[PDB]
């Protein structure tokens, strides 16, 4: 939560464990990398996890999770979406985000 | 809600101790957690945050933080049967003139599960001259 | 100077649009979200933007704020002579360790 923090921590890190109010301030620690990660700076001890890109919802990965950007998915070849938020692609019936 | 007034003698004499009383009203800084800061502003100039206390009602007793260029003069505590933080200022001189605002530091939703850190609620402030 | 820089004054006819900028560096802005505050004429400070474009409770939608690499920006856009008082921008400095304020910019709304 952060409450007793008095010091944030940057993209890409989180506190190595719940700030207190008697304890010495912890460190910031990195998220790790392919699975977790902080886009924004924040005082809590925890990261996000980073999302998947199911083949079963037509997705596959465009760009791999880092520690500071969540994992970024696209359509499989032959399937589209035409909103900007896409919980799956379905087949081409045409770009990745149209259809012909 | 929450209230905050700041209280404190408005001319203070160099080397001598600045003592300033920040009375919260509205609410109880003992029943769960509470975090201050004191922010300071030189007339006709800018803002400047001098330190800060993360106080548990519980414990009765809080940590500190405090800006570095104070050089370790500024201290700041909790009184909780007044609802009351303080500041304290040594060794003081000309360049500590300024209006002083006590305000409260919370940690606001964005609305999708992060938190970020504002002062939400400040006093009115009490101005403070130094001079001999 | 504060390590973020905002021009001291802006200004515009009433029902125009100004634009504040408040420029840091890879150790503030770069990492941390900005705080506006808004100081009326012999008031205190109060909180006008948090977490670079949330409106805090209360404040016009008319104002807005965004961020940008190491700069963000507060815009007011349909201005009205209540709106003349002095902006900060507010963030966390890696190399002060500590919470940081722009020097303020004062909004005149010409006359």
């Known amino acids: 939560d952060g409450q007793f923090c008095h010091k944030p921590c940057p993209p890409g890190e989180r506190k190595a464990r719940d700030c207190t109010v008697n304890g010495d301030e912890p460190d910031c620690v990195p998220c790790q990398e392919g699975k977790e990660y902080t886009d924004k700076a924040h005082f809590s001890s925890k990261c996000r996890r980073c999302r998947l890109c199911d083949e079963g919802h037509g997705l596959e990965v465009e760009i791999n999770c880092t520690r500071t950007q969540n994992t970024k998915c696209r359509c499989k070849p032959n399937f589209f979406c035409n909103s900007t938020v896409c919980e799956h692609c379905d087949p081409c019936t045409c770009t990745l985000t149209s259809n012909t | 809600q929450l209230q905050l007034q700041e209280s404190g003698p408005g001319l203070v004499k160099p080397s001598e101790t600045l003592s300033l009383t920040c009375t919260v009203s509205?609410?109880?800084?003992?029943?769960?957690?509470?975090?201050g800061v004191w922010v300071r502003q030189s007339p006709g100039k800018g803002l400047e945050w001098v330190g800060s206390?993360?106080?548990?009602?519980?414990?009765?007793?809080?940590?500190?933080y405090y800006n570095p260029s104070l050089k370790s003069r500024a201290t700041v505590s909790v009184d909780t049967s007044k609802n009351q933080v303080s500041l304290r200022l040594t060794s003081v001189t000309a360049a500590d003139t300024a209006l002083y605002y006590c305000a409260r530091r919370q940690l606001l939703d964005d609305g999708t599960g992060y938190q970020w850190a504002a002062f939400d609620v400040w006093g009115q402030g009490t101005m403070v001259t130094v001079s001999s | 100077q504060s390590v973020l820089t905002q021009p001291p004054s802006v200004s515009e006819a009433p029902r125009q649009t100004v634009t504040i900028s408040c420029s840091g560096n890879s150790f503030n802005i770069g990492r941390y979200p900005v705080n506006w505050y808004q100081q009326l004429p012999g008031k205190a400070p109060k909180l006008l933007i948090y977490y670079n474009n949330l409106r805090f409770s209360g404040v016009s939608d008319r104002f807005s704020g965004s961020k940008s690499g190491t700069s963000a920006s507060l815009a007011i856009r349909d201005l009205l002579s209540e709106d003349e008082a002095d902006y900060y921008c507010?963030?966390?400095?890696?190399?002060?360790?500590?919470?940081?304020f722009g020097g303020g910019t004062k909004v005149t709304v010409l006359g």
């Open positions: 509205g609410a109880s800084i003992s029943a769960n957690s509470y975090y």
């Open positions: 206390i993360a106080y548990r009602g519980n414990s009765n007793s809080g940590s500190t």
């Open positions: 507010s963030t966390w400095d890696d190399t002060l360790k500590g919470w940081v």
